[PDB]
Amino acid sequence: KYIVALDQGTTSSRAVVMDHDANIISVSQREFEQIYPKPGWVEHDPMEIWATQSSTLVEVLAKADISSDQIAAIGITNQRETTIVWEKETGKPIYNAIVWQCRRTAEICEHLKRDGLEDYIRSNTGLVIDPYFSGTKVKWILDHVEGSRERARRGELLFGTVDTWLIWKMTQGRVHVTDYTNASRTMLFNIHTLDWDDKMLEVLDIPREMLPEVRRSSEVYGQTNIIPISGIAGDQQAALFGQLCVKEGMAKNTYGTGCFMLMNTGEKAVKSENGLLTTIACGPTGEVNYALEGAVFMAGASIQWLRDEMKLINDAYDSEYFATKVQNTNGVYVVPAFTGLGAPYWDPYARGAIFGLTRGVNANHIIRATLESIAYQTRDVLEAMQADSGIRLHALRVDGGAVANNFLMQFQSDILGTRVERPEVREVTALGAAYLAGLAVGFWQNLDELQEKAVIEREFRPGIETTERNYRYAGWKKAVKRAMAWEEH
Amino acid sequence: KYIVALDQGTTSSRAVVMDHDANIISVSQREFEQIYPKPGWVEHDPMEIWATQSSTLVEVLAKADISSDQIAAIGITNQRETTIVWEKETGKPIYNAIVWQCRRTAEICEHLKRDGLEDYIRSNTGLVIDPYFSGTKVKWILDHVEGSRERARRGELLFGTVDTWLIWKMTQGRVHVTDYTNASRTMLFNIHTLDWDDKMLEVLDIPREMLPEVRRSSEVYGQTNIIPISGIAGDQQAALFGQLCVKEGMAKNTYGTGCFMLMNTGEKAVKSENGLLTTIACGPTGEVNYALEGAVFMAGASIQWLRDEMKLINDAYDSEYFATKVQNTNGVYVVPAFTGLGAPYWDPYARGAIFGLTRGVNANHIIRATLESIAYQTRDVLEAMQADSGIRLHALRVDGGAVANNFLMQFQSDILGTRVERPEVREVTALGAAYLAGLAVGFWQNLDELQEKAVIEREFRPGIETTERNYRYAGWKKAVKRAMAWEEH
Amino acid sequence: KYIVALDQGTTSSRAVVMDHDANIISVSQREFEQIYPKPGWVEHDPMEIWATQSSTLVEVLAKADISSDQIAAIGITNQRETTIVWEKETGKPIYNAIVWQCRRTAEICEHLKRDGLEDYIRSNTGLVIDPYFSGTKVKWILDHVEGSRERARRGELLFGTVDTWLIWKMTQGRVHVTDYTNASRTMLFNIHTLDWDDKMLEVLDIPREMLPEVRRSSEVYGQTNIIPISGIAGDQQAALFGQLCVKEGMAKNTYGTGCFMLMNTGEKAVKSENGLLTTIACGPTGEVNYALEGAVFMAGASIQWLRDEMKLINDAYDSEYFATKVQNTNGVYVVPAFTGLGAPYWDPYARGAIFGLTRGVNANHIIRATLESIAYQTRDVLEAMQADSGIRLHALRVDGGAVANNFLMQFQSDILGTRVERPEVREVTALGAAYLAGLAVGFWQNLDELQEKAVIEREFRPGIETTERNYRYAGWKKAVKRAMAWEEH
Amino acid sequence: GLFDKLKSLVSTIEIIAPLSGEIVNIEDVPDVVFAEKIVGDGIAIKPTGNKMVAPVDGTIGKIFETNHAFSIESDSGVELFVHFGIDTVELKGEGFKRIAEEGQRVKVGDTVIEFDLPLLEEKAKSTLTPVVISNMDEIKELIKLSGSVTVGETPVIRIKK
């Protein structure tokens, strides 16, 4: 038998079929549009998110000739924060998915601060008043469509982040459920009480009728004639589970659209005082642990901008070749704040910038600086992580699409002055969601049956160039201070 | 009320909503992969053809907030020839759609000639023994999958070109129907008897159980809860109807993936002796007329190869800018025989070629030669058309995606030495299928209510450069003679 | 003390300063325009050839602070065949240098064949009636300018290939001299008698007054206040000397603008019967030996066309990266006959061509096929070499700008099925001219003092892919047969 | 009938026969890179029955895309190359069904390619199958066996390291 994982990214939809003891037996990726209405804004069409994620599900099995009969369970990983409000009868959204990236609700965010609700939302959600979370995004959809807050109490429309939109389409409307990791992200859910916070729900005038049933990350939630849906987790929280991190002080950094570094902090919620998040993640059996988090919005997406918009490279993979043709960036810094900064800075008003240009700066100097900003952002959250936790990491276990790039991984260990342990199954986000699903169906019973699979393919060590790491990083901190607060308000 | 047209291309899926008296009220395009397993081979996944064409249907209405209630009927236009064999119960193909372009069945084609079945297939189908038609493509799918010709008589698997695959998915399996224009294309259907030819069906060992119910192009065939499906026609035969050509000697040339020139020849089937096809097309009420046809396989697809594979241009539209930066191609000829030639040549063994290269030939000389081969191919079929029909055209009414390019249209009228009349609704393939559908539902009653819409936006006349047209064309005929018969057999 | 070498290429001008026992102490490269008046035609401006080659001479010394005092002698290597006719008083050409590449004199060449002068010119010059040689090129300059053949006998205008134009500018008009290797190339010089052939001089109506004093390749010819000029040799004949080949059966292949393979045949002139040339080259002391030669016109120049005209690569060096991203060319062949073929084919009427194009052929398939045609051309002359000499080479000693490319060198040894020995000073054309100069001044006394320097940096051996070498080569011989005889006459 | 799901009579580096037939000297192989030891050294086999098997316990380096040949790396640091016939890329696939995977762990006797020998005798220029050590710098002594061999059973070479 097999476990099917349904990984739904910011830029793509992946479904992967897995046998007993984690072998990737089959995989399917399917890209979808990124919609940009205004400059600071990002958006997806929920129907394209469903169109690709369903067709990916029907691909993997067909590729390997498998259907229903052989699959023990279905786990779900998803991009976190992006709000969706749809119609209960029809199955039609009253608007496009406003993405986690999107900065339109910064105006709302500014009012929540001018009230004095920052110490509240910090201490009960573990989050920070930012456009990033779904809280303000729902208010915006509500405040802009006509019917909205009356169809709301009358119960015709439903809220959902991508985990609950996908299951409501898989169970033909039957079950409307979140898990704890995804709900922690909305800024509407108390993290201590483990239920929807209703001072928040007041403040943003959201009816409690819209909300999903928040449930565990490892539990059968319903069945689909795709058969049981047993695992759900936010993609980065399932990457932490896929890394088998799961114990106090265990961390990873994922290089996907953005870079998200998370450290499991047991059954303790630690208060950050260096710009990080206090979130919810899973323990060894799929139970609520807490985790510290640093989230930088742009990382492999920057490499995607070089390729599609900017046309400087053709393959995201050709950035390694062109970055290692110049030895340095010749004073050039790319600050990738395309949708604000966030990271430890928060500030939704910064836009992207390229600094210190000279007459002999060529395209390779730009390409290398773009890859280098991924490693400087990772260092900004890593030292915020270390100053928060009180723990110094002596290796950085990494994963994501971008870790296939040896220049970036090596440059990363030189600027950090620490080792960078790369695994050989690099896209572990769809394994943490397969593990959460296998466990709840008895396909696995627990994590120790899966220790063996974490095999570090390569370990990067700081070479002699690590001696300039603080000269190069000081240049980045000057560059960041100038990209900040560009947009007026 | 509105008419919905479902246009399914070789490279894309288009659905367009139309009000009374042809106004394009809403449109949706959605691209899908082109699969190339071996070099001469082309292929599509029937599920991606369905995935995009269904989501396009749900797009157009949502864009304009419309659903079922307001739509009088649904017409269907489709890429012709590409064979699909699927499963009757499940709704799952035993193989990918082998495209019209694809050259794998050339081996089969060579046997049909070594027998002596060319005068038969010519005189009863109006076609020519080529890999292009579905006849041989079905035999190939059958001969290669295991179950095949026994599940065939037992009736578990169904044949279909794209019109019948899309309706069998729209009516949940209920109706399995072709129309006359699409069936004319398969090389399994007699064009005089107007039923499946069964010397053909013998020869290619196809069971008659697989085949659709061949019906008119204007008839309600079934209903879908998308509501009646009333028009069906092969995309180029609906382009001829959209041009309101419909009478003896009336012709058009469509510049899409390929270039297809067709002339309506009334209720007479004319025998070609200059390399053309005798096909079926519609009359004023949706009835069987005949038509002469020249089909060249590569035209806007060549411009697509410059952009995606070759990376020389970024927009298909930037080919006009770069083509008009050099005044000539500097002796360079591009012969676009990427999937054989066909056109008047037939010969499945020619592959593409660029000739007469010199040390100072630059990218713009290649880009302009690529656009120029579209106009030289159009002249090869046009004079075959004129020598066949006995009629000289004094203007060429054109349509398709490529006619938006003024260099190509003008260069076209100079090499032809005739005017080129461009209409302002240029993609008329989805109008001929809307007209066929409106008529069968009473939404229109007939074509005279639609004369008014054909308004020629621009007429191109041969400027002074038409004086070199035969020097430039003689160079092309030398180039073509060298691309021919490259592949061994 | 030092020896200065003045290397004057087809596309560039190089001067290099060398100490005792061949250390490259300083170097200078300077590019100049390539003029293309008609498509088959190539041309240089003699003043730009002088402008760059003089400024390069003043660069190298200044770089290393050296002048006159320290330099023992000056050797000269030059592109062979390109004719120049100038004014004796003024120092002003009556025309641009018509290059070796240039095909304009093909008309003249056709008359020389229709007479019956091919067995004559073959057996007394060792050459073949082609546009390639200077013989016909001078006649053309003469026949087209007004004064010409009367100012000729009156002695106001002088003939010269690039070796004699550069010394006539260095000695302010004083000495007008060739060496034997360069004169062998003009088709006006008997190779057995070792003086200007005057049946040739008759036939092409060239006055004997124009011609230089043909001298040895190692001899002080004059002095310049640049101080003695003591070595002169055609660039490929000085590459053979730089390789220290110099004995019977010793060969090299140089990968520059073109590929030129030469084998020293002692003091015997061997008659070729497989399309090659019988030329003059140096022996161990700078004396007339003979050599067999195969010359293919395009090789590193093709890689230059991808970069400048075609814009597919940016660095000639990025062709290795993009060529090794696709594993094969997907049936694609580039025949680089940009200025005719020549090589073993001779035929001035072939132009360049890219064959077997398909819809999924991308830019990397073109880039790799371009590099691959350099190795297929080398095999065409190598087996003509082996069938002529009766010797089988068990390694190919190579040099030139292109041998820095590991894909090409390796692909070369797989298609040949022989080893490819690369040296570490790769541009040995300016060493053979430094050796010829050092010897004549006593700076060296002889070649044995220089054995030590030939140190093979890398030896390429045929890997397992050599097993398909004859399938891949058979495809090239089909491609070549279709590029041939494109231009009419 | 076919006996694959049926149990078999199982029982200083040996290279086990990748296929059955007579061992033939490689210098009798009519393609000079084999005949003159250029690409490697080892032996040839005039093949008699339809499979091509892993000749040592190791990983498959690469199967040529036309399927006629493959590369293997033994765990004992040896690299072999099995190539069915000569100039067999010209067939473009005809007669070869690939079974193992490009970079797969295999034990001796494991099928890696199946072939259609009646077709292949009519069409290929030669059917002689070179099995050569391409790693020959690294091996000190190479012992060559003779006579009949049976696929997955009989030893063809004995290399010492």
Short mmCIF file of C-alpha atoms in Angstrom, two decimals, chain A residues 189-451:
data_model
loop_
_atom_site.label_atom_id
_atom_site.label_comp_id
_atom_site.label_asym_id
_atom_site.label_seq_id
_atom_site.Cartn_x
_atom_site.Cartn_y
_atom_site.Cartn_z
CA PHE A 189 -7.00 31.88 16.87
CA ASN A 190 -5.74 31.89 20.42
CA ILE A 191 -2.61 29.78 20.78
CA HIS A 192 -2.94 29.11 24.54
CA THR A 193 -6.70 28.43 24.69
CA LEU A 194 -6.40 26.55 21.36
CA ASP A 195 -9.73 27.89 20.10
CA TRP A 196 -10.73 30.95 17.99
CA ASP A 197 -9.92 34.13 19.89
CA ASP A 198 -12.99 36.31 20.05
CA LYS A 199 -11.55 39.72 20.95
CA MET A 200 -9.86 39.35 17.55
CA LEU A 201 -13.04 38.15 15.88
CA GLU A 202 -14.77 41.22 17.34
CA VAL A 203 -12.13 43.73 16.22
CA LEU A 204 -12.07 42.52 12.63
CA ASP A 205 -15.86 42.04 12.53
CA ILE A 206 -15.68 38.51 11.36
CA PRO A 207 -18.64 36.24 12.15
CA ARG A 208 -17.74 33.05 13.96
CA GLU A 209 -20.10 31.23 11.57
CA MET A 210 -17.48 31.37 8.76
CA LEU A 211 -14.72 29.58 10.59
CA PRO A 212 -13.65 25.90 10.30
CA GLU A 213 -13.57 23.25 12.93
CA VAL A 214 -9.98 23.44 14.14
CA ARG A 215 -8.68 19.91 14.63
CA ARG A 216 -5.43 17.93 15.17
CA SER A 217 -2.82 17.53 12.40
CA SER A 218 -3.09 13.74 12.67
CA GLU A 219 -6.70 12.60 12.79
CA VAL A 220 -9.09 11.18 10.09
CA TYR A 221 -11.19 14.23 9.19
CA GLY A 222 -13.47 12.76 6.52
CA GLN A 223 -13.18 10.50 3.44
CA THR A 224 -13.04 11.45 -0.23
CA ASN A 225 -13.72 9.37 -3.32
CA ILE A 226 -10.38 10.58 -4.70
CA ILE A 227 -9.76 7.45 0.61
CA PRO A 228 -9.47 8.93 4.24
CA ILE A 229 -7.95 12.38 4.72
CA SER A 230 -5.82 11.95 7.88
CA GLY A 231 -2.99 14.52 7.90
CA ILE A 232 -3.10 18.32 7.60
CA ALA A 233 -0.25 20.84 8.28
CA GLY A 234 1.00 24.26 7.04
CA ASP A 235 3.84 23.55 4.57
CA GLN A 236 6.72 24.73 6.73
CA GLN A 237 5.38 23.01 9.83
CA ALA A 238 5.21 19.81 7.81
CA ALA A 239 8.81 20.45 6.63
CA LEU A 240 9.84 20.61 10.30
CA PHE A 241 8.00 17.27 10.84
CA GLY A 242 9.53 15.79 7.64
CA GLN A 243 12.95 16.76 9.02
CA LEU A 244 11.87 14.75 12.09
CA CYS A 245 12.80 17.79 14.11
CA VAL A 246 9.92 17.26 16.69
CA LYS A 247 12.01 17.78 19.95
CA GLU A 248 13.20 20.88 21.93
CA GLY A 249 15.75 23.01 20.09
CA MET A 250 15.42 21.07 16.81
CA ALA A 251 15.35 23.33 13.75
CA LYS A 252 15.32 23.55 10.00
CA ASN A 253 15.32 26.22 7.33
CA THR A 254 13.32 25.70 4.15
CA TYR A 255 14.30 27.39 0.94
CA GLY A 256 11.10 27.58 -1.08
CA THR A 257 9.30 30.76 -2.39
CA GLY A 258 10.52 32.26 0.84
CA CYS A 259 12.89 30.99 3.55
CA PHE A 260 11.22 29.84 6.78
CA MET A 261 13.33 28.85 9.73
CA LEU A 262 11.58 27.14 12.59
CA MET A 263 12.77 25.65 15.86
CA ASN A 264 10.58 23.24 17.90
CA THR A 265 10.30 24.53 21.50
CA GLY A 266 8.47 21.59 23.14
CA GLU A 267 5.33 22.22 25.07
CA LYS A 268 6.42 25.72 25.87
CA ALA A 269 5.42 28.89 24.04
CA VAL A 270 8.53 31.14 24.06
CA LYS A 271 8.07 34.90 23.78
CA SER A 272 10.25 36.42 21.05
CA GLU A 273 12.00 39.71 21.65
CA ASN A 274 14.14 39.76 18.47
CA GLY A 275 11.46 40.02 15.78
CA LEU A 276 10.36 36.36 15.47
CA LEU A 277 7.03 34.46 15.66
CA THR A 278 5.72 32.04 18.19
CA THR A 279 3.72 29.48 16.23
CA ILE A 280 2.27 25.93 16.66
CA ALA A 281 3.98 22.87 15.15
CA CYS A 282 3.59 19.03 15.66
CA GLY A 283 5.23 16.73 18.26
CA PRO A 284 6.19 13.01 17.63
CA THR A 285 2.58 11.80 17.48
CA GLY A 286 1.00 14.83 15.73
CA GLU A 287 0.26 16.83 18.88
CA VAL A 288 0.56 20.52 19.62
CA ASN A 289 4.10 21.58 20.21
CA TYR A 290 5.14 25.19 19.80
CA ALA A 291 7.88 26.60 17.53
CA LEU A 292 9.84 29.82 16.98
CA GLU A 293 9.68 31.19 13.41
CA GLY A 294 11.38 33.56 11.09
CA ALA A 295 9.83 33.96 7.73
CA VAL A 296 11.44 35.80 4.83
CA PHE A 297 9.06 36.29 1.90
CA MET A 298 11.46 36.11 -1.04
CA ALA A 299 14.08 33.49 -1.66
CA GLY A 300 13.52 31.00 -4.57
CA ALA A 301 10.88 33.46 -5.83
CA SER A 302 13.76 36.03 -6.51
CA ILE A 303 15.48 33.46 -8.70
CA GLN A 304 12.09 33.05 -10.39
CA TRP A 305 11.90 36.84 -11.03
CA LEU A 306 15.38 36.74 -12.77
CA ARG A 307 14.07 34.07 -15.04
CA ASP A 308 10.53 35.14 -15.95
CA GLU A 309 10.29 38.90 -15.56
CA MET A 310 13.86 39.95 -15.83
CA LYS A 311 14.78 37.26 -18.43
CA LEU A 312 18.45 37.27 -17.30
CA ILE A 313 18.66 33.38 -16.90
CA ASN A 314 16.29 30.77 -18.68
CA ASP A 315 16.68 28.08 -15.96
CA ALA A 316 16.60 28.87 -12.19
CA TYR A 317 19.45 26.38 -12.22
CA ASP A 318 21.64 28.52 -14.54
CA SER A 319 21.93 31.05 -11.70
CA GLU A 320 24.64 28.84 -10.10
CA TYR A 321 26.74 28.90 -13.33
CA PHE A 322 26.48 32.67 -13.80
CA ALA A 323 26.94 33.43 -10.09
CA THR A 324 30.20 31.59 -9.91
CA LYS A 325 31.68 33.34 -12.95
CA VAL A 326 32.45 36.55 -11.00
CA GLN A 327 34.06 35.84 -7.50
CA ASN A 328 32.04 38.68 -5.91
CA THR A 329 29.18 41.06 -6.61
CA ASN A 330 31.48 44.11 -7.04
CA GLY A 331 29.78 46.03 -4.22
CA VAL A 332 26.27 45.29 -5.51
CA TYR A 333 23.43 44.39 -3.13
CA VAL A 334 19.96 43.10 -4.16
CA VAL A 335 17.41 43.63 -1.34
CA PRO A 336 14.49 41.33 -2.35
CA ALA A 337 11.66 43.15 -0.58
CA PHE A 338 9.20 42.67 -3.44
CA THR A 339 6.17 42.39 -1.08
CA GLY A 340 7.57 44.18 1.96
CA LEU A 341 10.31 42.78 4.10
CA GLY A 342 8.85 40.93 7.07
CA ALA A 343 11.66 38.59 8.21
CA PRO A 344 12.88 40.30 11.50
CA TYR A 345 11.97 43.74 10.19
CA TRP A 346 8.24 43.45 9.58
CA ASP A 347 7.53 46.94 7.82
CA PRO A 348 5.10 46.28 4.89
CA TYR A 349 6.25 49.48 3.17
CA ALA A 350 9.65 48.41 1.82
CA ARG A 351 9.91 47.44 -1.84
CA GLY A 352 12.81 45.73 -3.63
CA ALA A 353 16.08 47.52 -4.47
CA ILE A 354 19.53 46.99 -6.12
CA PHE A 355 22.29 49.14 -4.58
CA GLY A 356 25.86 50.21 -5.28
CA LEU A 357 25.78 50.04 -9.08
CA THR A 358 28.84 50.95 -11.13
CA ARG A 359 29.63 51.17 -14.82
CA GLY A 360 31.31 47.75 -14.94
CA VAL A 361 28.65 45.88 -12.90
CA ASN A 362 27.33 43.16 -15.32
CA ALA A 363 24.38 40.69 -15.26
CA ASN A 364 26.36 38.03 -13.35
CA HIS A 365 26.99 40.54 -10.52
CA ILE A 366 23.20 40.99 -10.24
CA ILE A 367 22.50 37.23 -10.48
CA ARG A 368 25.08 36.44 -7.75
CA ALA A 369 23.78 39.26 -5.50
CA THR A 370 20.26 37.86 -5.80
CA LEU A 371 21.42 34.42 -4.59
CA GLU A 372 23.47 36.10 -1.89
CA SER A 373 20.49 37.95 -0.43
CA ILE A 374 18.88 34.55 0.30
CA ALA A 375 21.89 33.75 2.58
CA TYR A 376 21.92 37.21 4.19
CA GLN A 377 18.21 36.94 5.05
CA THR A 378 18.73 33.48 6.52
CA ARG A 379 21.47 35.03 8.78
CA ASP A 380 19.13 37.84 9.90
CA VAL A 381 16.57 35.30 11.23
CA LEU A 382 19.20 32.77 12.46
CA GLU A 383 20.81 35.19 14.89
CA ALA A 384 17.35 36.37 15.97
CA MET A 385 16.66 32.61 16.55
CA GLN A 386 19.84 32.17 18.57
CA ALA A 387 19.31 35.33 20.65
CA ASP A 388 15.73 34.15 21.35
CA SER A 389 16.30 30.52 22.13
CA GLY A 390 19.60 31.00 23.90
CA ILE A 391 20.95 28.09 21.78
CA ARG A 392 23.77 28.33 19.25
CA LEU A 393 23.31 26.09 16.19
CA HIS A 394 26.34 24.16 15.14
CA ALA A 395 24.89 23.06 11.85
CA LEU A 396 21.91 24.20 9.84
CA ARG A 397 19.79 21.37 8.53
CA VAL A 398 18.22 22.69 5.31
CA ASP A 399 15.67 21.70 2.67
CA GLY A 400 13.69 23.15 -0.22
CA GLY A 401 14.05 23.56 -3.96
CA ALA A 402 16.94 26.03 -3.73
CA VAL A 403 19.31 23.78 -1.65
CA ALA A 404 20.16 21.94 -4.88
CA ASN A 405 22.44 24.99 -5.62
CA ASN A 406 25.94 24.37 -4.30
CA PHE A 407 27.11 28.01 -4.54
CA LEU A 408 24.20 29.19 -2.31
CA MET A 409 24.64 26.40 0.23
CA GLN A 410 28.39 27.00 0.49
CA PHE A 411 28.06 30.83 0.50
CA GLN A 412 25.43 30.19 3.20
CA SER A 413 27.84 28.27 5.43
CA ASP A 414 30.59 30.95 4.87
CA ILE A 415 28.34 33.89 5.87
CA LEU A 416 26.98 32.03 8.88
CA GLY A 417 30.27 30.49 9.85
CA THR A 418 28.42 27.22 10.61
CA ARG A 419 27.96 23.90 8.74
CA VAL A 420 24.98 23.40 6.41
CA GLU A 421 23.69 19.81 6.40
CA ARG A 422 21.79 19.01 3.21
CA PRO A 423 19.51 15.86 3.10
CA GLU A 424 19.05 13.82 -0.14
CA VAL A 425 15.29 13.99 -0.27
CA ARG A 426 15.23 17.75 -0.38
CA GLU A 427 11.55 18.52 -0.71
CA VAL A 428 10.49 17.19 2.69
CA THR A 429 7.30 19.23 2.96
CA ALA A 430 5.27 16.43 1.35
CA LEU A 431 6.86 13.87 3.71
CA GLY A 432 5.87 15.59 6.93
CA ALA A 433 2.29 15.54 5.63
CA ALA A 434 2.59 11.85 4.62
CA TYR A 435 3.99 10.95 8.06
CA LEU A 436 1.14 12.86 9.79
CA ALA A 437 -1.25 10.84 7.60
CA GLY A 438 0.37 7.43 7.92
CA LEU A 439 0.47 7.70 11.71
CA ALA A 440 -3.30 8.43 11.97
CA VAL A 441 -4.24 5.40 9.88
CA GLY A 442 -1.81 2.95 11.50
CA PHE A 443 0.29 2.77 8.29
CA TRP A 444 3.17 3.77 10.54
CA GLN A 445 2.37 3.98 14.33
CA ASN A 446 5.40 6.34 14.79
CA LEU A 447 8.46 8.29 13.82
CA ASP A 448 11.13 5.86 15.00
CA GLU A 449 10.11 3.54 12.12
CA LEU A 450 11.31 6.54 9.96
CA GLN A 451 14.61 7.70 11.56
#
